[PDB]
Amino acid sequence: RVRSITLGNSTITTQECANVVVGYGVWPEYLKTQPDVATCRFYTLESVQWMKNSAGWWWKLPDALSQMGLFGQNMQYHYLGRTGYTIHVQCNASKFHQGCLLVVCVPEAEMGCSNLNNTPEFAELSGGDTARMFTDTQIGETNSKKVQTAVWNAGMGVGVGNLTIYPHQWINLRTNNSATIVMPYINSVPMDNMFRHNNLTLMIIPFVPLNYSEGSSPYVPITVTIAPMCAEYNGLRLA
Amino acid sequence: SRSESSIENFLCRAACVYYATYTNNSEKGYAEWVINTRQVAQLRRKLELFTYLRFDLELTFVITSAQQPSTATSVDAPVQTHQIMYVPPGGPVPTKVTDYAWQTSTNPSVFWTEGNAPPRMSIPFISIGNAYSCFYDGWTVYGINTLNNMGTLYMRHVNEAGQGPIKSTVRIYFKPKHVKAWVPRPPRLCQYEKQKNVNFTPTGVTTTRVGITT
Amino acid sequence: SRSESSIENFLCRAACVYYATYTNNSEKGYAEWVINTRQVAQLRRKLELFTYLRFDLELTFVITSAQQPSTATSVDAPVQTHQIMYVPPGGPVPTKVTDYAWQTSTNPSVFWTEGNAPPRMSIPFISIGNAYSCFYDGWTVYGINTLNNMGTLYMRHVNEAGQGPIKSTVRIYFKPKHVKAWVPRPPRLCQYEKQKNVNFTPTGVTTTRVGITT
Amino acid sequence: GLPVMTTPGSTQFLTSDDFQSPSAMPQFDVTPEMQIPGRVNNLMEIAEVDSVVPVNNTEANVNSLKAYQIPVQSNSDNGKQVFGFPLQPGANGVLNRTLLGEILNYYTHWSGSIKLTFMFCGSAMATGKFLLAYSPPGAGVPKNRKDAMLGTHVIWDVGLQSSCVLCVPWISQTHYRYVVEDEYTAAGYITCWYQTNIVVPADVQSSCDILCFVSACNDFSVRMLKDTPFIR
Amino acid sequence: GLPVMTTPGSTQFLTSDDFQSPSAMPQFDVTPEMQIPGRVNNLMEIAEVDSVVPVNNTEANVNSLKAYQIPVQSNSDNGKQVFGFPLQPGANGVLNRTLLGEILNYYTHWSGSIKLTFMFCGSAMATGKFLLAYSPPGAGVPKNRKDAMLGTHVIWDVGLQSSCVLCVPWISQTHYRYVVEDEYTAAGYITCWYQTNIVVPADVQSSCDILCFVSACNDFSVRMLKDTPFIR
Amino acid sequence: GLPVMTTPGSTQFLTSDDFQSPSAMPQFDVTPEMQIPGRVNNLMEIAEVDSVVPVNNT
């Protein structure tokens, strides 16, 4: 069965019996100053092409929606804000395609730099709506301000197989093709500046590479849909 | 049961985090340490299993002295008294043994004389934020989060120099108390390279055997 | 809440107000300090936010010694004992290390030997008036108000001089307790010029920018 | 005797300790306390008292009463800015040495709202309109009367009212307390513009002056007492 | 004063002591605690989270994602072993750096059961049968599909199920807790065999991959915290 | 603080003393005790067991 979900002036369709992973057992809620409900619309980013040699993709959350409608408008307008997210990841593949994906949302995914003495620049840390790709090779140290994008360390100097500690969902093409992660607001402060701090990082890493026989489509599109939940910002009026 | 695997029993252990020396005839004979949890790799890794932490600080100081060479016919130095000053974040900081900062009333200080039980002071959670952050994906410089400032410690001889120099060494013992942790994270796998950042050099996922089958 | 901005939390802080040295082979080797709150500018300014104050006194003494040069083949001085005498207003005052004033029974004194916890004594509100005055617009000399006399402190070595001189330094720590304040006053703006009077040299109201508009 | 054990820190002198101490003068008997008017229980009572803001720093004015005088006069063209200063109570310069600023500079963290009062001190026959605009932190200062009006603002008619009171909002990084001192951080500004010229009858001076007052309005609080930077 | 006696160890500093200590900053007032999602009360909550097992160590693979991929393909002759590793969570190499292994390597004694999950990541049209065999400690590893079948085993049909979950039993020398590290001791093994070949239709790849996951299943516990051997 | 006085023998180590001592391994959690047969509560239980007397020393 297919379930159609409409949010604002946007609507998407999902398999009725799809499993949703709630981040830490906590749904997005309001801070127990000024909320916005016109932002509650699905934002379908550009689809990426999963290939045989694909190493992975990642998107920093606040930044990914920085050039999308009122949410971006609110980001430049207000100085402070806080919000949760609902992330939909969908793959369009046939039964003749095989592969396994890890879809994980990492809070405060601070990333290292190829040069041990420096830190990565903003461009390399985030591409906004554009996706950032991991690399199956090791970035050389000569490079001065790029992210060490070796997949098996996930750019954080940890075991990539241990990323399952963070809210995640597996996409096994033979079994399922969609993932839904509900991420609450997680921070050490009640509100924060959205332009200088990326609270969340969504990662999609192929643990089992995509495989197919000659004649089948040589790619599998992956579509990311993000819907901000319970967004609210600081007031701008007097007392 | 698993009482020993709780957060409190996992992190509430004293550890020597810093070690320094200072003599009493140099004008610069004072030891300083900015309080940070990244000094010791073992403690850093244990704290970096989580993203946000909230704890109190218990500090114990082990101070010992040693007689330095002199030419005095006879040396009969009295018992030595040491001053340990805690400078809260934003407080004045000394640059010499004789400096006003040593007398700031808002900089709590402990005066301790040798031969007694080692001095001990406790600092509470002093962040304007609601928790300390071991990881920060943003800019203030990438991933600094100045909301983690915990203050600085300073140490100096109180006694004036006698007929011979005295060199003292201080061992700072660090113990988180009433710890609360949030958002588990994967254990650090690559070796730590810098104390200030998370930079790493790519390494293998695990140790290797000959073949997949025994 | 604002618990830290209360009068008690604002003024009840220990501070080093006086520092002096005295040797044990001079006849004049004794330290004296008339108890007054105008010695330290930082404490003076904090107390001068009000006109009338009422508080108790807690004094902690940090005494350390240093060996002075000698010609004795061998120096083996025993542990040193110090006498700290508080002279109430109107009490006899010493002029030498050997003086009757040191033995006055109505002058409370503390005998303390080195190596132990520092000595501590407390003096209550000892004014014939109902409160201390930080400002007095009148004559007794303009603006003295002899009703603010708080006594004097004296310090000397108890041990006789051995085979080598010993020089000791005393740090007096001052802490108002159970403070009550009346009649708020504007914070001091000009730099303090004299300890005895309020004299000042005219200065600007604040720091200056280029123009009224950003 | 009873068995005891001394823990670490037994003979130490911690300057922030709170222990019973022996009385040097037991049996003294103190003068009973009288009822003196003006008892102070908290420094924040001092912080909530209005004080005159030296808006006109203008170093030729800091050594005079002109530091508090904001000049207002009839200008040929309209829409000029009357004044403007950042809303940094404790670091800027205009609010540094006021009653609120002095108390704040004794602490490292502070919270609450700022109450600004403007008093027109021209003749009773002078009339005009002023636009008082508040720029939230992050947003830049207005460059025109139009931009000021499009934001948060109040139209002040001196012909009807001699005083206007604004309570600027807290608005901080969900920090509850924020640093008294700051570093190239979003500040927030207040500015004033000529909505109209000053209309005056014959034999009445067109040039007038405005006085600004500041005080803590909402639940103000401070934390982490420190040394004031104004003493040597 | 009251007569007291100091017992041995009165002025000593024992690094594991638990004594009241004086506060350096009394009267500070701390920022109230907020509700942050993901509160952790015990490391065993981390130990019970499934993580990917690098079964294919194969040093040409430890620096890639192939370390987690168990190759499966259509072989001419049947009954070959797919994989196999000792069940030593904390010493071997395959389970050393997993979430379970990292927690275990912080302690000297541990107890409980191991939950192993295997996920088939081939095409939806691929069919076949796998024999997953568990060898108890002491008993040797099977050398054939027949020997594996005669022991404790589960027949796994990928055509019907994509995942299989096994909870290996504790079984220890009535010790309740046993050493995390070990020395030439009965280990216990898990192994996989081709019950049938992988049957595939036309235009479908026969070569597939299997993923293995590990986690603590039954009442897991640890004892005697120590230093992890993975830091320098 | 509370006034106290140290009596003679305050810092001494008497080998027969019975005082509380700090635990070097607090939070260890010991292996629970099992029922082992042959529990001994007094040496006199051993003393009351018959044993063969070497009468013929020789």
Side-chain angles (χ1 to χ4, degrees):
Chain A
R1 276 268 47 73
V2 206
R3 180 161 111 271
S4 179
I5 313 155
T6 163
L7 263 197
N9 59 341
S10 55
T11 171
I12 64 158
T13 36
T14 67
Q15 24 256 301
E16 214 113 19
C17 286
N19 75 122
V20 26
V21 165
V22 183
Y24 290 93
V26 166
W27 288 81
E29 223 72 13
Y30 279 130
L31 203 186
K32 359 265 326 267
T33 104
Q34 165 254 181
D36 190 281
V37 296
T39 33
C40 210
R41 35 162 358 246
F42 292 117
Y43 292 95
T44 294
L45 324 172
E46 190 188 20
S47 295
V48 292
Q49 279 221 330
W50 182 10
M51 266 161 318
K52 291 194 154 144
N53 63 339
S54 292
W57 311 263
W58 87 76
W59 297 261
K60 307 239 150 238
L61 243 321
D63 203 49
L65 301 180
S66 60
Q67 271 70 62
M68 306 252 164
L70 165 81
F71 198 78
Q73 286 322 288
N74 280 330
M75 280 203 7
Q76 39 263 12
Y77 284 9
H78 305 84
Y79 184 60
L80 294 190
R82 57 127 65 190
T83 175
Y85 299 95
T86 294
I87 299 114
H88 285 94
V89 174
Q90 278 145 345
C91 311
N92 294 91
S94 86
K95 267 158 64 223
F96 287 68
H97 288 96
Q98 41 179 274
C100 196
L101 289 175
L102 173 59
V103 180
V104 53
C105 215
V106 180
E108 303 269 17
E110 189 181 332
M111 311 204 164
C113 177
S114 34
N115 186 279
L116 287 189
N117 284 297
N118 317 333
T119 41
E121 30 170 290
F122 178 81
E124 316 266 356
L125 269 156
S126 53
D129 35 31
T130 333
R132 284 276 168 268
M133 310 183 317
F134 288 107
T135 308
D136 66 333
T137 84
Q138 157 176 351
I139 306 238
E141 172 122 35
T142 69
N143 313 53
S144 310
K145 304 261 297 182
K146 316 167 64 123
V147 173
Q148 184 53 258
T149 45
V151 213
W152 56 103
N153 294 148
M156 317 210 249
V158 300
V160 66
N162 290 333
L163 283 180
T164 57
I165 184 90
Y166 293 126
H168 73 292
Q169 169 105 44
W170 290 97
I171 296 193
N172 193 1
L173 282 193
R174 89 187 308 253
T175 299
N176 63 310
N177 76 292
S178 86
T180 310
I181 333 249
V182 179
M183 287 307 292
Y185 178 72
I186 304 146
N187 206 347
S188 53
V189 276
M191 293 225 330
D192 206 341
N193 181 246
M194 305 174 111
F195 265 109
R196 61 134 49 135
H197 176 220
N198 288 314
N199 310 55
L200 278 168
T201 294
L202 172 75
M203 276 176 218
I204 302 182
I205 292 131
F207 268 69
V208 170
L210 175 78
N211 210 358
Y212 51 86
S213 293
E214 175 57 31
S216 279
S217 286
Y219 48 68
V220 165
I222 309 174
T223 296
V224 183
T225 295
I226 312 168
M229 289 251 299
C230 292
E232 62 196 319
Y233 306 76
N234 69 282
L236 302 121
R237 46 184 19 109
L238 296 191
Chain B
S1 184
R2 22 174 86 165
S3 177
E4 222 195 310
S5 48
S6 86
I7 296 322
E8 187 73 45
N9 292 355
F10 179 61
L11 293 167
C12 198
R13 315 262 180 157
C16 183
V17 283
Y18 189 64
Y19 159 83
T21 60
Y22 52 99
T23 200
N24 64 343
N25 66 355
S26 126
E27 276 99 307
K28 287 303 287 194
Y30 64 101
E32 49 167 311
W33 180 62
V34 180
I35 304 179
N36 68 320
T37 67
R38 300 217 195 156
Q39 201 89 33
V40 197
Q42 283 277 349
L43 175 60
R44 184 183 174 172
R45 195 178 188 260
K46 294 184 22 173
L47 286 168
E48 283 182 351
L49 292 192
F50 319 96
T51 305
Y52 304 119
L53 289 122
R54 213 175 132 106
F55 51 84
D56 288 329
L57 259 167
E58 188 179 276
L59 297 161
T60 313
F61 308 87
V62 175
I63 295 130
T64 60
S65 306
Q67 187 208 340
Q68 298 311 107
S70 164
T71 49
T73 68
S74 188
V75 177
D76 194 44
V79 61
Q80 293 305 296
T81 304
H82 302 263
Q83 166 171 23
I84 306 112
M85 177 180 33
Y86 169 66
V87 180
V93 132
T95 54
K96 283 176 309 316
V97 285
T98 52
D99 191 285
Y100 148 77
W102 293 106
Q103 292 104 235
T104 308
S105 86
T106 58
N107 289 357
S109 162
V110 176
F111 292 91
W112 170 91
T113 168
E114 281 166 11
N116 301 272
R120 175 175 276 163
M121 66 190 342
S122 168
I123 294 117
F125 179 73
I126 61 242
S127 175
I128 47 159
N130 295 73
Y132 297 129
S133 314
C134 262
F135 294 89
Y136 180 62
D137 187 19
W139 289 261
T140 44
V141 185
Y142 178 60
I144 286 308
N145 192 30
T146 182
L147 264 66
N148 289 334
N149 194 358
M150 277 166 279
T152 324
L153 285 159
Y154 285 85
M155 275 93 45
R156 66 153 176 170
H157 294 109
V158 182
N159 289 46
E160 292 182 10
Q163 290 323 108
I166 287 162
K167 173 156 140 191
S168 289
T169 104
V170 47
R171 284 182 229 282
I172 314 187
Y173 270 77
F174 179 118
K175 190 222 253 179
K177 281 185 320 197
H178 323 106
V179 204
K180 295 184 161 87
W182 295 271
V183 192
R185 318 195 112 241
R188 175 81 178 204
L189 167 71
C190 307
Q191 288 310 307
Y192 289 122
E193 299 275 6
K194 309 277 157 148
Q195 186 163 138
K196 37 174 161 103
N197 49 59
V198 294
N199 291 4
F200 60 93
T201 34
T203 50
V205 154
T206 183
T207 36
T208 118
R209 53 192 194 156
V210 194
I212 207 168
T213 148
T214 309
Chain C
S1 184
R2 22 174 86 165
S3 177
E4 222 195 310
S5 48
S6 86
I7 296 322
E8 187 73 45
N9 292 355
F10 179 61
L11 293 167
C12 198
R13 316 262 180 157
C16 183
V17 283
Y18 189 64
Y19 159 83
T21 60
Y22 52 99
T23 200
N24 64 343
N25 66 355
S26 126
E27 276 99 307
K28 287 303 287 194
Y30 64 101
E32 49 167 311
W33 180 62
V34 180
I35 304 179
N36 68 320
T37 67
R38 300 217 195 156
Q39 201 89 33
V40 197
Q42 283 277 349
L43 175 60
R44 184 183 174 172
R45 195 178 188 260
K46 294 184 22 173
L47 286 168
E48 283 182 351
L49 292 192
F50 319 96
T51 305
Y52 304 119
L53 289 122
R54 213 175 132 106
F55 51 84
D56 288 329
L57 259 167
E58 188 179 276
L59 297 161
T60 313
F61 308 87
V62 175
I63 295 130
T64 60
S65 306
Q67 187 208 340
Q68 298 311 107
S70 164
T71 49
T73 68
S74 188
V75 177
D76 194 44
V79 61
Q80 293 305 296
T81 304
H82 302 263
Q83 166 171 23
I84 306 112
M85 177 180 33
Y86 169 66
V87 180
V93 132
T95 54
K96 283 176 309 316
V97 285
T98 52
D99 191 285
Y100 148 77
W102 293 106
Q103 292 104 235
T104 308
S105 86
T106 58
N107 289 357
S109 162
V110 176
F111 292 91
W112 170 91
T113 168
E114 281 166 11
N116 301 272
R120 175 175 276 163
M121 66 190 342
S122 168
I123 294 117
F125 179 73
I126 61 242
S127 175
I128 47 159
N130 295 73
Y132 297 129
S133 314
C134 262
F135 294 89
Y136 180 62
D137 187 19
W139 289 261
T140 44
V141 185
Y142 178 60
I144 286 308
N145 192 30
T146 182
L147 264 66
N148 289 334
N149 194 358
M150 277 166 279
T152 324
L153 285 159
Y154 285 85
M155 275 93 45
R156 66 153 176 170
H157 294 109
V158 182
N159 289 46
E160 292 182 10
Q163 290 323 108
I166 287 162
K167 173 156 140 191
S168 289
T169 104
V170 47
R171 284 182 229 282
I172 314 187
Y173 270 77
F174 179 118
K175 190 222 253 179
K177 281 185 320 197
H178 323 106
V179 204
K180 295 184 161 87
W182 295 271
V183 192
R185 318 195 112 241
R188 175 81 178 204
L189 167 71
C190 307
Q191 288 310 307
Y192 289 122
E193 299 275 6
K194 310 277 157 148
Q195 186 163 138
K196 37 174 161 103
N197 49 59
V198 294
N199 291 4
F200 60 93
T201 34
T203 50
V205 154
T206 183
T207 36
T208 118
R209 53 192 194 156
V210 194
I212 207 168
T213 148
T214 309
Chain D
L2 168 85
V4 296
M5 232 179 319
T6 62
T7 80
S10 58
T11 70
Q12 70 171 23
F13 168 40
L14 171 73
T15 56
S16 6
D17 71 332
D18 197 46
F19 292 138
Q20 296 305 116
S21 48
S23 163
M25 314 258 302
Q27 95 237 293
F28 163 69
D29 197 76
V30 309
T31 300
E33 196 211 310
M34 72 178 352
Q35 282 276 333
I36 313 191
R39 172 81 176 288
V40 184
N41 296 289
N42 201 286
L43 254 48
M44 291 310 260
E45 289 163 41
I46 301 173
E48 310 185 332
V49 170
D50 267 318
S51 43
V52 200
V53 177
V55 175
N56 210 358
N57 287 344
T58 297
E59 94 310 0
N61 297 336
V62 281
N63 297 282
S64 278
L65 272 147
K66 315 207 270 323
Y68 310 96
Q69 292 154 14
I70 299 153
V72 157
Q73 82 288 321
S74 60
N75 43 317
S76 59
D77 57 325
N78 219 29
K80 272 167 226 103
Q81 201 176 341
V82 186
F83 62 87
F85 51 90
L87 284 188
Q88 302 160 326
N92 184 213
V94 291
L95 312 159
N96 227 337
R97 319 297 324 252
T98 181
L99 280 184
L100 177 65
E102 297 278 354
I103 303 286
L104 286 184
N105 278 67
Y106 268 117
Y107 292 83
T108 78
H109 315 136
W110 69 274
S111 168
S113 323
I114 290 331
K115 183 148 60 74
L116 282 169
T117 299
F118 303 96
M119 168 186 287
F120 185 74
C121 301
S123 158
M125 320 267 276
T127 39
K129 270 176 203 288
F130 291 107
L131 202 153
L132 283 157
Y134 163 63
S135 296
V141 316
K143 309 150 307 323
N144 315 294
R145 193 212 50 91
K146 188 161 180 253
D147 310 56
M149 171 273 300
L150 293 170
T152 288
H153 71 310
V154 165
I155 308 289
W156 183 27
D157 198 329
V158 290
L160 266 73
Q161 283 205 312
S162 293
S163 77
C164 206
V165 183
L166 321 186
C167 163
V168 338
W170 174 224
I171 316 296
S172 89
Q173 203 242 265
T174 79
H175 273 155
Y176 174 45
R177 244 105 168 194
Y178 120 77
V179 195
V180 171
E181 316 83 9
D182 289 345
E183 13 69 78
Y184 201 34
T185 345
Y189 297 69
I190 173 90
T191 168
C192 194
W193 309 80
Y194 284 102
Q195 173 62 60
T196 83
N197 284 340
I198 287 296
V199 180
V200 99
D203 301 313
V204 186
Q205 296 271 334
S206 49
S207 62
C208 317
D209 276 296
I210 309 198
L211 288 183
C212 175
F213 303 98
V214 77
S215 136
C217 159
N218 293 312
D219 44 353
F220 229 75
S221 59
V222 280
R223 224 159 63 142
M224 191 144 324
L225 184 81
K226 68 184 276 259
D227 266 10
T228 174
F230 305 136
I231 273 302
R232 53 91 72 77
Chain E
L2 168 85
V4 296
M5 232 179 319
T6 62
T7 80
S10 58
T11 70
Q12 70 171 23
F13 168 40
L14 171 73
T15 56
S16 6
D17 71 332
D18 197 46
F19 292 138
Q20 296 305 116
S21 48
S23 163
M25 314 258 302
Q27 95 237 293
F28 163 69
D29 197 76
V30 309
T31 300
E33 196 211 310
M34 72 178 352
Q35 282 276 333
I36 313 191
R39 172 81 176 288
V40 184
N41 296 289
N42 201 286
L43 254 48
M44 291 310 260
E45 289 163 41
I46 301 173
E48 310 185 332
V49 170
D50 267 318
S51 43
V52 200
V53 177
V55 175
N56 210 358
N57 287 344
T58 297
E59 94 310 0
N61 297 336
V62 281
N63 297 282
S64 278
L65 272 147
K66 315 207 270 323
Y68 310 96
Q69 292 154 14
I70 299 153
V72 157
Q73 82 288 321
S74 60
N75 43 317
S76 59
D77 57 325
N78 219 29
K80 272 167 226 103
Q81 201 176 341
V82 186
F83 62 87
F85 51 90
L87 284 188
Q88 302 160 326
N92 184 213
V94 291
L95 312 159
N96 227 337
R97 319 297 324 252
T98 181
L99 280 184
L100 177 65
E102 297 278 354
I103 303 286
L104 286 184
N105 278 67
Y106 268 117
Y107 292 83
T108 78
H109 315 136
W110 69 274
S111 168
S113 323
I114 290 331
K115 183 148 60 74
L116 282 169
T117 299
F118 303 96
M119 168 186 287
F120 185 74
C121 301
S123 158
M125 320 267 276
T127 39
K129 270 176 203 288
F130 291 107
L131 202 153
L132 283 157
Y134 163 63
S135 296
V141 316
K143 309 150 307 323
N144 315 294
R145 193 212 50 91
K146 188 161 180 253
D147 310 56
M149 171 273 300
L150 293 170
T152 288
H153 71 310
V154 165
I155 308 289
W156 183 27
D157 198 329
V158 290
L160 266 73
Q161 283 205 312
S162 293
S163 77
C164 206
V165 183
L166 321 186
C167 163
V168 338
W170 174 224
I171 316 296
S172 89
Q173 203 242 265
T174 79
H175 273 155
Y176 174 45
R177 244 105 168 194
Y178 120 77
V179 195
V180 171
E181 316 83 9
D182 289 345
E183 13 69 78
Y184 201 34
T185 345
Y189 297 69
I190 173 90
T191 168
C192 194
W193 309 80
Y194 284 102
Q195 173 62 60
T196 83
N197 284 340
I198 287 296
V199 180
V200 99
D203 301 313
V204 186
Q205 296 271 334
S206 49
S207 62
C208 317
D209 276 296
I210 309 198
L211 288 183
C212 175
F213 303 98
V214 77
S215 136
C217 159
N218 293 312
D219 44 353
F220 229 75
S221 59
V222 280
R223 224 159 63 142
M224 191 144 324
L225 184 81
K226 68 184 276 259
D227 266 10
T228 174
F230 305 136
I231 273 302
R232 53 91 72 77
Chain F
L2 168 85
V4 296
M5 232 179 319
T6 62
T7 80
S10 58
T11 70
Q12 70 171 23
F13 168 40
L14 171 73
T15 56
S16 6
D17 71 332
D18 197 46
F19 292 138
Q20 296 305 116
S21 48
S23 163
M25 314 258 302
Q27 95 237 293
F28 163 69
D29 197 76
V30 309
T31 300
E33 196 211 310
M34 72 178 352
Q35 282 276 333
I36 313 191
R39 172 81 176 288
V40 184
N41 296 289
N42 201 286
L43 254 48
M44 291 310 260
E45 289 163 41
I46 301 173
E48 310 185 332
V49 170
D50 267 318
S51 43
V52 200
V53 177
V55 175
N56 210 358
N57 287 344
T58 297

